């Protein structure tokens, strides 16, 4: 029996491959050959934030485009005013090994988690002036790799178990358990309209998940190695994925296929974060060799380098107003670029 | 106008946070973090929900022991969280060829580009309970054992037969082969024979964590 299902699976896989090949009527690098190159994008280290004791593992900008959360394995979340370098709060974590953070579209709540298998939802705007854990979402059977708010009420979380979950924070229960990945779902990014998200995993696949239906809509398979990072293109119709294969790739949901590969032969280091500028035109990728490289998303060509980190860039984030790029690193500093 | 009031309030909150973080920096720097990683965890813990935490002190030195439970077997993504522990405490049972699997896990721990600069304190546990090996299968899984004499630098405790002083030293030689062949100056491996009853292993953890920190400082002064 099992061999019959293997053969049928291979037949469907070759159907999908043939369909993709038939629908690859053009190539992106050829369609946009005449677009004007961006020249060189020399970004200034306009602020450096020096609060964390240990390696920063995640950071996230608020919708206000001014405040950021940063999470470090010292067990502190720090909320930074990027206009002033002032720390607004620092929050002690019950487990020092945080691996993800997120900050709600309202700015009321901040999320964090890591090897504790728990997502911790902190309230920043409680009247008591302290910051206290509003909920500990604990039904995960492995480390939390990413967290992203859909609203103050709902958080999607990604695990080192092969599953993601949509949590209702007041219920404390996972209302859906997106299941079908075959490895650790390292990275998570929500669509600009929060009806879909795409998750990138240690099976070289990224999968597009319907938050309301819970089904897996599409599997994108081009990568050679673990997808450490994923980000939607601000249109909601494409996303980019970074991998240990030292490549970023741009996937289009409606073409169902890889439109571009971003690589350079002197890059052997894996990608640790990917984000897009507000136009989408620039892809910013963080790398293991303590650098960030900025890519023309429509040309697959380099545009600039954010140097001056001492150690692995762990998190990268572009403000919603597009004004600045944050880059956290194992050097324990956030550097904000503009 | 309110801009000055806001700036003053924000700077006061910042000063409180600076005070807290500066106070916690000394506690973080004083506490040695240890990753406990089993390929005999009870023997190496009882004598000294996700990640699990044992917090203890030796000679007023704070040690913080982290056991990675309820994580799936694919270590490659989470183990990078521990590039800044003082030691990876690798407990291997003398005891599938669990020695080979433990040894390949240790080789991967050693060579991984982020886990360099983390030393390994290698407790060969259960060296009584199975390594007594009084059978009238180390010889079967490791055929090169037939060519290995017990070393001249062997320092036994009596009551262990030469069968055990062969077995345990051969296993140590295998781990030290992995250690020596691919690491110099940046990370060190401290083998320790240990047993289900043999307590005061915590003292050897302390002694080798101290050695790690001493070697770090000598490394910074460029003296080694």
């Amino acid at each position, epitope marked *: 029996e099992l061999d019959q299902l*293997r053969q049928e699976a291979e037949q469907l*896989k070759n159907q999908i491959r043939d369909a993709r090949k038939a629908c690859a009527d053009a190539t992106l690098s050829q369609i946009t050959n005449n677009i004007d190159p961006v020249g060189r994008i020399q970004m200034r280290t306009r602020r450096t934030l020096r609060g964390h004791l240990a390696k920063i593992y995640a950071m996230h900008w608020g919708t206000d485009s001014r405040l950021l959360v940063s999470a470090s394995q010292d067990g502190k979340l720090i909320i930074w005013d990027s206009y002033t370098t002032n720390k607004v709060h620092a929050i002690p974590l019950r487990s020092s090994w945080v691996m993800t953070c997120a900050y709600a579209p309202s700015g009321n709540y901040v999320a964090c988690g890591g090897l504790d298998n728990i997502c911790s939802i902190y309230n920043l705007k409680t009247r008591e002036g302290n910051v206290r854990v509003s909920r500990e979402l604990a039904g995960h059977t492995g480390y939390l790799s990413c967290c992203r708010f859909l609203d103050d009420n709902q958080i999607v979380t990604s695990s080192g178990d*092969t599953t993601c979950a949509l949590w209702d924070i007041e219920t404390g229960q996972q209302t859906t358990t997106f299941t079908g990945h*075959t*490895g650790d779902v390292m990275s998570l990014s929500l669509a600009p309209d929060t009806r879909l998200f795409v998750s990138g995993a*240690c*099976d*070289a*696949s990224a999968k597009l998940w319907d938050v309301r239906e819970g089904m897996c809509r599409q599997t994108f*398979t*081009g*990568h*050679e*190695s*673990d997808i450490n990072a994923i980000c939607f293109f601000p249109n909601g119709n494409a996303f980019a994925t970074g991998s*240990d*294969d*030292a490549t970023c790739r741009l996937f289009d949901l409606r073409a169902d296929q890889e439109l571009m590969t971003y690589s350079h032969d002197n890059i*052997i280091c*894996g990608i640790t974060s990917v984000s897009f500028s507000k136009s989408g035109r620039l892809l910013l990728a963080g790398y293991d060799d303590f650098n960030c490289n900025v890519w023309d998303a429509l040309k697959a060509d380099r545009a600039g380098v954010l140097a001056g980190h001492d150690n692995r860039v762990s998190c990268l984030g572009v403000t919603d107003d597009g004004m600045a790029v944050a880059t956290g690193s194992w050097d324990s500093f956030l550097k904000i670029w503009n | 106008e309110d801009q000055r009031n806001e700036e003053k309030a924000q700077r006061e909150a910042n000063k409180k946070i600076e005070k807290q973080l500066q106070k916690d920096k000394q506690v973080y720097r004083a506490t040695h973090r240890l990753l406990l990683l089993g390929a005999g965890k009870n023997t190496i813990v009882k004598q000294m929900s996700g990640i699990f935490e044992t917090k203890f002190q030796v000679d007023k030195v704070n040690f913080h022991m982290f056991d990675v439970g309820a994580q*799936r*077997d*694919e*270590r*490659r993504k989470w183990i990078q969280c521990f590039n800044d522990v003082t030691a990876i405490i690798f407990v291997v049972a003398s005891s*599938t*060829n669990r020695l*080979q*699997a433990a040894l*390949k*896990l240790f*080789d*991967s*721990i050693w*060579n*991984n*580009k982020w886990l360099r600069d983390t030393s390994v304190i290698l407790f060969l546990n259960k060296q009584d309970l199975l390594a007594e090996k009084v059978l009238a299968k180390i010889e*079967d*899984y*490791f*055929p*090169e054992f037939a060519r290995y004499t017990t070393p001249e630098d062997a320092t036994p405790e009596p009551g262990e037969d030469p069968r055990v002083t062969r077995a345990k030293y051969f296993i140590r030689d295998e781990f030290l082969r992995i250690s020596t062949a*691919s690491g110099d100056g940046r990370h060190y491996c401290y083998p320790h024979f240990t047993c289900a009853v043999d307590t005061e292993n915590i003292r050897r953890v302390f002694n080798d964590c101290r050695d790690i920190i001493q070697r770090m400082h000598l490394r910074q002064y460029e003296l080694l």
Partner: nanobody
Framework: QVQLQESGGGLVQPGGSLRLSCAASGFTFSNYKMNWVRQAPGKGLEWVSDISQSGASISYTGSVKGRFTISRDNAKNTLYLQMNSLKPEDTAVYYC?????????????????????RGQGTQVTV
């Protein structure tokens, strides 16, 4: 997709010789070390042999040293495991397994029941 497909005879006499081959696809074969893993009936997976990027660094599990011989053909994305004097204990499903990351020296790939980057296996029975 990253794909590995093993081949090699399901049944053989004791003392026989056999050759496994794995066709690799979807990854830059020259960049990744390759491992062989096996699963005996009712037991966990165990590492059998490994081969570095160039085929320079090679090692074996001790019950296999000299009885098998590993080689890799970087020209055709093909990994081989030669077998001689197959013993009853070598009766297993044999899985081809790839290091998770290019250019690295480490691997974490024996993980039972779950791992990408590892093939469907070919039976050997003695």
């Amino acid at each position: 997709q990253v794909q590995l497909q093993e081949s090699g005879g399901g049944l053989v006499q004791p003392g026989g010789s056999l050759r496994l081959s794995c066709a690799a696809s979807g990854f830059t074969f020259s960049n990744y070390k390759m491992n062989w893993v096996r699963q005996a009936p009712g037991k966990g997976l165990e590492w059998v042999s490994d081969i570095s990027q160039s085929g320079a660094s090679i090692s074996y599990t001790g019950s296999v040293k000299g009885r098998f011989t590993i080689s890799r053909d970087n020209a055709k994305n093909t990994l081989y495991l030669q077998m001689n004097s197959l013993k009853p204990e070598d009766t297993a499903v044999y899985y081809c397994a790839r290091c998770p990351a290019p250019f690295t020296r480490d691997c974490f790939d024996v993980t039972s029941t779950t791992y990408a980057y590892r093939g469907q296996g070919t039976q050997v029975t003695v």
